[PDB]
Amino acid sequence: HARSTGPYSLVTQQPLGGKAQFGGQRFGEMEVWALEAYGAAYTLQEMLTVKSDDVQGRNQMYKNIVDGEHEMVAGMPESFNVLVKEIRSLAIHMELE
């Protein structure tokens, strides 16, 4: 199976998993190490932030591909925001300085 645009979750803005309900294949933990062993930060940042996790980059990259221009915007994912909002609910102050 294959997919390009699918459904997203509510906790973290990520695609689902499985052949049913249009779920993308999970990028493993060791695959990130195999990518970082080659270096290649541009194909590791584009396959982690603007592909799945960003709520604005996932639309901006699609708009740039359909239109024709090439100008990407890097930003923090939504999962780190969910993690810091979960840490802040434990009476532990954590601010992005």
Partner: protein
């Protein structure tokens, strides 16, 4: 519910920051973070679908459930923004506001946090100078604290209140510990505990005093108040973070945190009502204890009482553990533009390209198809283009074939071990529903074709295509990162045809004639006028490189080796291919083609070699049957002779002469001898089976059987697999450790009974269990080895130090394991013996081989003078790429993937053998009474010397051993010169550095041997010194103690035999014998298994292991604290250059484990991602540390570029 105009709001957040700071939370910060309080626990109202007012899912506190709408419907338009209502006040904002802000709970009674109490370094016990059980009894309403600090029950409280007359107040619960944390002044307490550490000199009291002083110093430096451990206002999670998922039929799925929140709110409301209604004190204490247990179960469930048949998760369970957020949604996330298939081998494609199904290519490159249809003008809108795509016209396939011509994709098998698991190919459009792959690629993937799946990934940015083409294409990953051998090795189908093609026989048709060139051979082979193999004399042309110098000579070879001479490049001579193409021979040929020729010609040579092997394997037509597998003729006679022998042995045992153990030992000995004789007879009757004639006279030659060709050519089983198919398989083992007495006197060709099958099942299932456990332990060791060393990158081009190591080819007393040619290749020398600071290629090691060198000073990566990594000149030569190591390539992850990869495969008299002389080093001989030579030493080294200048073997000389010869005497082979009379947990034990079972006690320092002192329950061992006193310690009385009284101990010898501890050998001499011992033991383990791993991947790990150091004098920092080498060296040079002449003190190195080095780091994000998240978060909460953001994991977690590889100039221009 649905928003449309919010989708185009681009460039709303920048998120430009430098550091990450974490500290404690003030109650005013919690009161200002929230937007309201909650008082009624109700998350979903029944009989109507509306959020409950002031509940868990509320609208007046968090926000609206519908976007740009309110609850009632008074304001239901986008023109009204920021206008709240009067009956239900909801801010008419975006739907994103339900995830950012949160709520709080006003508690009438205080409650303490469980992370600062139930943790093993308890901070409250260090602050109040009390134990854990006393504060456990006090905080849970079972004792009393007066206000100096003591445990006090209720009868002591009443007898004190009867005599104090309401003048001695004592509180119980959270109020007492709150007043004790409030009323203390840490500024005077620091000086008071400084006087306490100036007075008390006990060692554990010193450790507790430095711990309390460091905690008070961190608390005063961070500015956090000690009263912030206990809390009054408890915040809650935002309602968008957890969903209320409905089920089929209008139901609702249960949750874990919502029930705990409703329980907390219910207990708080009951406690508030009991406090307002003036309840008696015992039920107020019971309600406060119940609220304390409920909050302690909410913060960390399962640590105190495990409040439920399945314990639900909490705020500490969905972060720490396997299903936590750090290992599920931070490191590895599910991405789009992906998909799996089933692999299928395809031989009609090159190694730089791969196959791809048409529907997968249409579904993956669909936005590119939309952009091409918009650019060509065949479809106006994307909806019409999508309908034309799903209608499946003929122009859609033309657009799909045109859009991906040189656009690379990524391929990745889902179980990956090393760094070559992700490669890039240029896909082509084929039919079917299976991805076609090159056969030479699957050697690196280790992917069998029994239904394996791999997931593809599509790089879609402008830079990711260049990053996948320049350094991830299959034509660039030729050499393995482990060793210098290339991964392009012909597999089981190619090397069989190449071995059938490149051999010869005695007499075939078409021999004896002279050919012109390779074209005449190809013109005479296809019309079947000559044989495939015949002793002919051909003439070939080959150039010579120094530069191109052509030359024409004559040679005598076969027809197949002459046909192989048309596909090899011109840089290779014919002498490297005239031998029969075996596995190691063709590996040496591929390495010699890659060494001194280039890359693209080696790539096209490996392309044509597989096609030649396929075209000759389809012409050979090899087949194994029941006639090709032969049995030995004397096998039945040897079996009957062994049967008569074991019958005579059993008769002599049952007659009453020999005991059962020695009879069983001699039975299995003669059965192993019979199995070896049967294997030798089977090899003799298989290898020398075929006979031929040469001019009438018969001659012997190598046989051309089906099994013998597959055995001798490689890419199959060893000689044991041929022994199990021809002769007896020997003696099988038992699971408890013993050997079965009865043998298996039948091969797989003959029939087998149930007894030997049941015996073989024991050895069959244990191998499967061992491979499963080895795979699990290999995955765990790979994860730990990745997470221990991930910051070492190539930063500079030179360090400046010239310390280096001493590289020597190690021997054990027999054949060599590795020569000097295999150990020094690819390194940088330290001093001249060959100039210094140079790179040793394959020619320089051959030039220094004949120079009779013994040990070369080589700069290794365990001694460098760089900051936050190592430099390029110290690491040496890369193993993956043949050139020098570039600036910006990480070497820790490559070394970890190289070490963790072969883990799933892993589970009296000295007679010489060489001919030469004998050398004497580290030995001392005394004159014997008979005129002979006897050596006296604690540990001797008897080494030999060959004619070339290298040592062949090295033996040991014990105390009083008599050597037959002297130094320089010529000793031949088979002579006796000695005369004296008497696993993967092992790999993990060196990385974790645990204590052994019987640790070897080493000496203190270089001192003379003294007499044994008197015992007082343990043995005392004294040592005589020159000027100082005697250093004595204890000894275990259970094991044997061998200390010589009238002798002399050298600088760091041993007194108890056994395996020594790494901490003792680090404390004794330094880091060089520890590094040599670790690399030697790991190399002996990996050579006993059979996988070669280069030494620098172990040197990087043992350099990262030795990072924390300690000091013995407090100059500017503390005393018992352990810091890194870099910061201590910087502050030492600062104090020596700016402050005074020689201000700081000397540092001493200490060793830590891999987990102990992964936990106690400088930062806190990467250390709280794999193990012990609660302890690291508790330590970072009271320290108030600031993350410097320099690593290869924390940039992945945050989301910026990593500072290794392509993203290096970004970090260079950022600072």
């Amino acid at each position: 519910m649905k928003d449309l105009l919010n989708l185009f709001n681009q460039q709303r957040q920048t998120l430009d920051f430098d550091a990450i700071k974490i500290a404690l939370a003030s109650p005013d910060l919690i009161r200002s973070w929230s937007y309201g309080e909650v008082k009624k626990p109700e998350t979903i109202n029944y009989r109507t679908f509306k959020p409950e007012r002031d509940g868990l899912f509320c609208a007046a506190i968090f926000g609206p459930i519908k976007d740009y709408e309110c609850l009632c419907g008074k304001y239901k338009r986008m023109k009204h923004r920021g206008v709240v209502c009067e009956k239900c006040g909801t801010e008419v904002t975006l739907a994103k506001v339900r995830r950012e802000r949160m709520g709080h709970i006003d508690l009438a009674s205080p409650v303490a946090h469980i992370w600062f109490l139930k943790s093993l370094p308890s901070r409250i016990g260090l602050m109040l100078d009390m134990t854990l059980r006393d504060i456990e009894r006090v905080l849970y309403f079972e004792a009393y604290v007066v206000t100096r600090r003591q445990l006090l029950t209720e009868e002591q409280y009443l007898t004190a209140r009867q005599e104090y007359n309401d003048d001695f107040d004592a509180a119980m619960g959270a109020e007492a510990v709150y007043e004790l944390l409030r009323t203390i002044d840490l500024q005077s307490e620091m000086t008071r505990l400084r006087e306490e550490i100036a007075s008390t000199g006990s060692e554990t009291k010193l450790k507790r005093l430095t711990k309390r002083i460091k905690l008070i110093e961190a608390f005063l430096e961070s500015g956090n108040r000690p009263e912030w451990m206990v809390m009054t206002v408890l915040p809650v999670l935002p309602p968008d973070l957890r969903p209320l998922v409905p089920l089929d039929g209008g139901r609702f799925a249960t949750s874990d945190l919502n029930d705990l929140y409703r329980r907390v709110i219910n207990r708080n409301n009951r406690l508030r009502r009991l406090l307002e209604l003036n309840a008696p004190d015992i039920i107020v204490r019971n309600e406060k204890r119940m609220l304390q247990e409920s909050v302690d179960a909410l913060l960390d469930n399962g640590r105190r009482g495990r409040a439920i048949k399945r314990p639900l998760k909490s705020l500490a369970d969905m972060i720490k553990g396997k299903q936590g957020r750090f290992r599920q949604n931070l490191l590895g996330k599910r991405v789009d533009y992906s998909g799996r298939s089933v692999i299928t081998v395809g031989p009609y494609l090159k190694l730089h390209q791969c196959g791809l199904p048409k529907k997968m290519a249409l579904e993956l490159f669909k936005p590119f198809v939309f952009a091409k249809l918009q650019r060509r003008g065949l479809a106006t809108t994307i909806k019409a283009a999508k309908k034309l795509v799903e209608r499946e016209e003929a122009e859609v396939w033309d657009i799909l074939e045109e859009v991906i011509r040189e656009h690379p994709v990524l391929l990745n098998r889902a179980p990956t071990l090393h760094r070559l698991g992700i490669q890039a190919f240029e896909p082509v459009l084929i039919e079917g529903k299976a991805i076609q792959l090159h056969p030479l690629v699957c050697t690196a993937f280790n992917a069998d074709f029994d239904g394996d799946q791999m997931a593809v990934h599509v790089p879609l940015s402008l830079e990711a295509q260049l990053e996948a083409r320049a350094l991830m294409m299959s034509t660039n990953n030729i050499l393995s990162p482990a060793n210098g051998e290339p991964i392009i090795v012909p597999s089981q189908d190619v090397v069989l045809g190449l071995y059938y093609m490149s051999r010869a026989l005695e007499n075939k048709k078409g021999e004896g004639m002279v050919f012109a060139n390779t074209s005449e051979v190809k013109r005479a082979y296809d019309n079947r006028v000559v044989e495939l193999h015949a002793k002919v004399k051909v003439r070939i042309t080959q150039v010579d490189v120094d530069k191109r110098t052509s030359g024409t000579s004559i040679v005598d070879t076969t027809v197949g080796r002459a046909l192989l001479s048309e596909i090899l490049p011109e840089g290779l001579p014919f002498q490297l291919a005239n031998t029969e193409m075996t596995k190691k021979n063709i590996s040496r040929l591929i390495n010699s083609s890659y060494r001194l020729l280039g890359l693209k010609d080696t790539v096209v040579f490996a392309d044509k070699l597989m096609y030649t092997g396929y075209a000759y394997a389809t012409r050979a037509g090899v087949s194994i049957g029941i006639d090709d597998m032969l049995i030995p003729d004397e096998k039945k006679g040897i079996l009957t002779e062994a049967e008569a022998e074991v019958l005579e042995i059993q008769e002599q045992y049952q007659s009453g002469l020999v005991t059962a153990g020695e009879r069983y030992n001699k039975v299995v000995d003669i059965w192993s001898r019979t199995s070896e004789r049967i294997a030798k007879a089977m090899m003799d009757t298989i290898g020398t089976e075929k006979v031929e004639n040469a001019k009438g006279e018969t001659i012997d030659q190598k046989s051309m059987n089906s099994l013998y060709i597959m055995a001798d050519s490689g890419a199959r089983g060893s000689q044991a697999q041929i022994r199990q198919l021809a002769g007896m398989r020997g003696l099988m083992a038992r699971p408890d450790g013993s050997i079965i007495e009865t043998p298996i006197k039948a091969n797989f060709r003959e029939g087998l009974n149930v007894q030997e099958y049941f015996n073989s099942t024991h050895g069959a299932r244990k191998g499967l269990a061992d491979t499963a456990l080895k795979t699990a332990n290999s995955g765990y060791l790979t994860r730990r080895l990745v997470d221990v060393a991930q910051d070492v990158v190539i930063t500079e081009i030179d360090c400046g130090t010239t310390e280096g190591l001493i590289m020597t080819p190690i021997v054990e007393g027999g054949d060599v394991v590795e020569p000097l040619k295999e150990r020094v290749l690819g390194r940088v020398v330290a001093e001249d013996v060959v100039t210094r600071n140079t790179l040793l290629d394959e020619a320089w090691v051959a030039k220094l081989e004949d120079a009779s060198v013994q040990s070369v000073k080589v700069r290794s990566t365990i001694s460098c003078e760089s900051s936050f990594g190592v430099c390029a000149r110290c690491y040496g030569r890369d193993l993956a790429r043949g050139h020098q190591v570039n600036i910006g390539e990480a070497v820790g992850v490559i070394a970890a993937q190289s070490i963790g990869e072969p883990g799933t495969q892993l589970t009296d008299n000295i007679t010489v053998k060489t001919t030469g002389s004998v050398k004497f080093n580290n030995l001392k001989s005394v004159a014997h009474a008979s005129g002979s030579l006897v050596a006296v030493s604690r540990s001797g080294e008897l080494s030999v010397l060959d004619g070339h200048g290298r040592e062949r073997e090295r033996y040991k000389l014990p105390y009083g051993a008599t050597i037959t010869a002297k130094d320089g005497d010529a000793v031949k082979a088979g002579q006796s010169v000695a005369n004296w009379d008497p696993g993967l947990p092992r790999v993990a034990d060196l990385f974790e550095a645990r204590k052994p079972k019987d640790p070897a006690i080493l000496a203190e320092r270089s001192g003379i041997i003294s007499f044994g002192k008197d015992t007082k329950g343990k043995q005392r061992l004294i040592i005589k010194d020159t000027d100082g006193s005697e250093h004595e310690e204890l000894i275990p009385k259970y094991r044997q103690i061998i200390v010589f009284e009238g002798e002399h101990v050298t600088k760091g010898e041993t007194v108890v035999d056994g395996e020594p501890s790494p901490q003792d050998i680090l404390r004794l001499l330094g880091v060089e014998p520890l590094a040599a011992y670790l690399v030697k033991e790991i190399q002996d383990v990996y050579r006993l298994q059979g996988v070669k791993i280069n030494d620098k991947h172990i040197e990087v790990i043992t350099r990262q292991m030795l990072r924390k150091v300690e000091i013995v004098d407090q100059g500017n920092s503390k005393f018992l604290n352990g810091e890194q080498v870099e910061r201590q060296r910087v502050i030492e040079e600062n104090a020596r250059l700016v402050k005074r002449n020689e201000l700081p003190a000397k540092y001493d190195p200490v060793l830590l484990g891999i987990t102990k080095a992964s936990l106690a780091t400088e930062s806190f994000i990467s250390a709280a991602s794999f193990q012990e998240t609660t302890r690291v978060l508790t330590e970072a909460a009271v320290r108030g540390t600031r993350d410097n953001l320099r690593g290869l994991k924390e940039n992945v977690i945050v989301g910026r570029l990593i500072p290794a590889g392509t993203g290096l100039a970004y970090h260079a221009g950022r600072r």
